[PDB]
């Protein structure tokens, strides 16, 4: 029942190996080979050893000769085997693109068989293994994402020099007796009342010995004993189906905030002759999911009978697929700190632990295949990936089986996208549906993330109409343009493009002169944006920032304006979709922000950056997604309350006030006694009238207080008397140009205010520190302290990351106080005492001890 991952390898180019058979012979010399940990691409392995500078900085990645990655590389290891009484297997996936496998001088599998990143291989190497020092070697072939059913980077970033060739998951060494236990899973079915489930346990047993056997498969499912005995001819595999097991009052798995995240255990041993032969432990969640088309044709998800608006971002791993379990948990925890409920994985489907963590945290996941490369090559015409040939078909089907087998018992998984872009043709789709059936993968299948239908499954109920680059806030509120990206249907991949990270991140990824060019000439190409010509520069963003904000006087000016613009836009993108969710006609049913994060240090399509720092786009998404929320509609000036939580709320007061930039209140409305339903329902407080005498740029302060008088949401907008308007006729696929621009340049002259800071920290016994900061607007006039950003820093003024704040980027009127809370690992302080750096738009910068 042993399954031990290979901890590491030594790697080298096949340019250095003239005899393949030699590598896997015990004693083969490996002087000058590179030691690498498990889950390394070739280039990630070279970085581990020195060998090139940090690709996260400037154009370092360009200085890597890529030619060396157009030939195979070897991954080699020794294995000590004390006792050959047990059978021996190599069980693995994640080979990019394909490999020959060698044990002790014998080629056990070729690249024609071991082919495709997602395919699983269970290689019986019993005949090759001997007592003592054994050796195993993979000759990994070059990866081309357009030719191979693998992973590529579309236009998200820049191309890794090795194109991710390597082994990016574990290779397991399995030991067992005559009988191998495989593919153990639990089919679970809950009644609609959610108080009774039925469990069908299924498990494969394979007799790899020379003789016929009886095997008993026995153990526990959800704490209940189970046992079946079957016969197996030599070399026979069987699927064992256990009689149905009833489960009363199951601990139902819920998305975060809707209840708990319990997973049950399955524990099984296959015995032969009254002796354990193999063993497997796994988990499953008791949870119903559905994804159906509503009367408007939009894809509508529900979990456990509760419909949900999907509010998420597109998730990506590291550009060089460097794996770290804590980092993965840190990234999914940020999902919840944002108030989001879902992540989409367009290809790049992460190792199991990622899904264990999403399960444990209650983050929903939307895995599927990616566009714009080999996956869609047979259906995507003149776009990138190659037409399919006969050998492609069984690789794609085996990839689907293997992913379906991996993914089926994770309750976070809410669907599989079998297409992205183009939906599969009938033959490809049929192979996917067959693979999923064979794996008992029973979750919703979505044909595409675009509007494109598949022949069998049908309409997607989703859209990808853009945009991916600058559009003003009001754009998201559009319902009139059926070929655009307004708040209706399921928005599976959309953003307003550029997302300048914090100054602290900027200074780590770009040179002074690259940064100088970024503010002075946004039209210039930026390596840390995209390899795509369409998204190669920041021109649309820079032009709108100038038009709407005012010209940038320096780098600092440009960055600070970038943050307001990103906060404003991302906030509107999300708020519009929350509002329109309960529309009678063409409701919004989903929004996946493009993207949650970036594969590397970037200037676009991120909420949190590669270092886990949090900028305007982050805080804006967090503001929009708070559980009891007040917001202002850019289209019609309606003030709207959203309740994200699982219970209806009552006796809410919504208070809306307009101020000129000199602090003069120009409008007040107090709406008491509001009720709002659960799980995304809304209430309208008031429609703000056109008010006379407003400054060109003015402020709207929205405050929601519960029946106890507690302030539960504060939302401040910087607004203009001059409207953003669209030139809909100038629209391209990725954006819509503006015919006129809001004037928010009044912010440039907003008078100075003051804060107002005290902080203290508590090192907990769970290895985390909580820093509490109390901020007060301490000025003696009428001016608000506007957009005040607090950052946990060490003694050198460097941000402590990752971090989670309850609230941030706050605005306080004179006399007003707010208390803020930041949590992080004590160890990420690295022995420094904590301080807090506090910067406001109109309050300057100070740091206080904590
Ligand atoms: N799935 C990709 C998405 O695919 C689309 C296909 C068609 C349209 N369209 O036709 O408006 C829009 C988007 O394009 C993004 C931006 O290039 C990529 O980053 C995503 O990975």
PDB file of C-alpha atoms in Angstrom, residues 567-568 571 575 623 629-632 657 659 698-703 713-719 784-787 809-813 816:
ATOM      1  CA  UNK A 567     -10.315  50.676  -7.815  1.00  0.00           C
ATOM      2  CA  UNK A 568     -13.124  52.578  -9.561  1.00  0.00           C
ATOM      3  CA  UNK A 571     -15.553  48.005  -8.264  1.00  0.00           C
ATOM      4  CA  UNK A 575     -21.202  45.938  -8.567  1.00  0.00           C
ATOM      5  CA  UNK A 623     -15.131  46.730  -1.695  1.00  0.00           C
ATOM      6  CA  UNK A 629     -22.882  46.088   0.769  1.00  0.00           C
ATOM      7  CA  UNK A 630     -23.996  49.509  -0.341  1.00  0.00           C
ATOM      8  CA  UNK A 631     -23.202  50.807  -3.846  1.00  0.00           C
ATOM      9  CA  UNK A 632     -23.925  53.561  -6.393  1.00  0.00           C
ATOM     10  CA  UNK A 657     -24.493  62.211   1.007  1.00  0.00           C
ATOM     11  CA  UNK A 659     -19.905  66.588  -1.053  1.00  0.00           C
ATOM     12  CA  UNK A 698     -17.454  65.583  -6.412  1.00  0.00           C
ATOM     13  CA  UNK A 699     -17.750  62.804  -3.770  1.00  0.00           C
ATOM     14  CA  UNK A 700     -20.596  60.452  -2.898  1.00  0.00           C
ATOM     15  CA  UNK A 701     -20.411  58.887   0.568  1.00  0.00           C
ATOM     16  CA  UNK A 702     -22.717  55.815   0.943  1.00  0.00           C
ATOM     17  CA  UNK A 703     -23.122  54.242   4.409  1.00  0.00           C
ATOM     18  CA  UNK A 713     -20.565  49.096   4.704  1.00  0.00           C
ATOM     19  CA  UNK A 714     -19.025  52.346   3.602  1.00  0.00           C
ATOM     20  CA  UNK A 715     -18.526  53.182  -0.068  1.00  0.00           C
ATOM     21  CA  UNK A 716     -17.061  56.428  -1.351  1.00  0.00           C
ATOM     22  CA  UNK A 717     -17.176  57.405  -5.049  1.00  0.00           C
ATOM     23  CA  UNK A 718     -15.272  60.097  -6.827  1.00  0.00           C
ATOM     24  CA  UNK A 719     -17.797  61.211  -9.485  1.00  0.00           C
ATOM     25  CA  UNK A 784     -12.204  64.153   4.241  1.00  0.00           C
ATOM     26  CA  UNK A 785      -9.066  62.006   4.527  1.00  0.00           C
ATOM     27  CA  UNK A 786      -9.533  60.311   1.179  1.00  0.00           C
ATOM     28  CA  UNK A 787      -8.293  56.864   0.074  1.00  0.00           C
ATOM     29  CA  UNK A 809      -8.252  52.079   1.313  1.00  0.00           C
ATOM     30  CA  UNK A 810     -10.703  53.918   3.603  1.00  0.00           C
ATOM     31  CA  UNK A 811     -12.093  57.466   3.603  1.00  0.00           C
ATOM     32  CA  UNK A 812     -12.816  59.316   6.843  1.00  0.00           C
ATOM     33  CA  UNK A 813     -14.628  62.595   7.406  1.00  0.00           C
ATOM     34  CA  UNK A 816     -14.375  59.955  12.214  1.00  0.00           C
TER      35      UNK A 816
END
